[PDB]
Amino acid sequence: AMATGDERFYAEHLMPTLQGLLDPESAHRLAVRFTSLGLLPRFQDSDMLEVRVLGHKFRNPVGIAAGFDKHGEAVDGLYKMGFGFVEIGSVTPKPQEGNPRPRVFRLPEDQAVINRYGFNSHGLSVVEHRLRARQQKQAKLTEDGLPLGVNLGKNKTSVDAAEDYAEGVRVLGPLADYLVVNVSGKAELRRLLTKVLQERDGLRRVHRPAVLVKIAPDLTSQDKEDIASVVKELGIDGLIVTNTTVSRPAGLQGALRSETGGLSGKPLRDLSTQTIREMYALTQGRVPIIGVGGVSSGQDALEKIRAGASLVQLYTALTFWGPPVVGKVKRELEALLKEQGFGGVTDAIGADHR
């Protein structure tokens, strides 16, 4: 009824109007500004959405994926939007501009975006001071089941990938509930992740974040088997499955389908779910998975949960549906959980594998 009306209006009228008036990067920039200022209305989270994972309570399992709030400017407005957790970044050590504009492209016919931002970042030091300003506010949020993740990048020109990520661990690890490293042979991955975990383990017990590895959906079977093996061997805390795809699934209609970059949204959905499914099996259900890629409904959310995800993220659906999508996904997920006989989200995790 009321929520649905709001959802209708945003999906059918407001967002298409606003996206038609703006270039896509301007739209992103304006969203971050509006969100930072809390210019949003406000769905009471039931107990059945609560998840305990990664050393933390999550009030609900629907997170904002990396890339929306690259520089940690809008964290409080994102909780206000109703996300159960927030992931900022990617943040690189040094400030960098990222790629030339235009670098974001809408494929509205496909409910997809292509981006090639190229890790535009304010840098660790700006983001550190920004999180420091609200550090105690975040400690209370985390305690109340609303944790904060930080995705760490590397500078375009850097010689030593591992040292960039290490810098990130040292600077932002003390302010994060979890840290994320994106990965694109096996001995080099082990070397990199060893160094990351060593740095993490050197932070004082109360400032010690979980470390997650975030994979694209474009990896070979050999890459996925090697990642599962290294993740288990090293005691990596979790996996974020997946980033955008450099593939172009047959059937894209948008005029901008041949733009270089990462494809997100609906055409990534089932690629992403199947990657969750394979990573869950290769890790024997022992490594918590955050599912991401084309979530715009409770059904999308539940398919990833049942495939092996403990938590989900979305970004692209926000570009088409606006802020009401968060309440929509949560409400539909709750209803689906009851319809399939699950007492809560926890019971559904990996339910397809059993």
Ligand SMILES: CCn1c(CO)nn(-c2cc3c(C(C)C)cn(-c4c(F)cccc4Cl)c(=O)c3cc2F)c1=O
């Ligand atoms: C991929 C880059 N990218 C694109 C282009 O593909 N769009 N986009 C978003 C834009 C918006 C906008 C724009 C249209 C002004 C407003 N609002 C919003 C709000 F922030 C506060 C109260 C009302 C509204 Cl509608 C959103 O939530 C929102 C979210 C997005 F992800 C975004 O990150």
Ligand SMILES: Cc1cc2nc3c(=O)[nH]c(=O)nc-3n(C[C@H](O)[C@H](O)[C@H](O)COP(=O)(O)O)c2cc1C
């Ligand atoms: C504009 C844009 C910027 C992104 N930036 C980042 C980033 O800096 N780091 C990262 O790990 N993922 C980034 N992502 C990937 C998302 O976090 C997510 O994995 C992907 O978009 C799939 O989810 P979706 O289909 O819900 O958007 C970005 C995605 C988009 C669309």
Ligand SMILES: O=C(O)c1cc(=O)[nH]c(=O)[nH]1
């Ligand atoms: O900044 C970007 O280009 C970017 C980073 C990332 O991890 N994923 C993505 O789709 N874009």
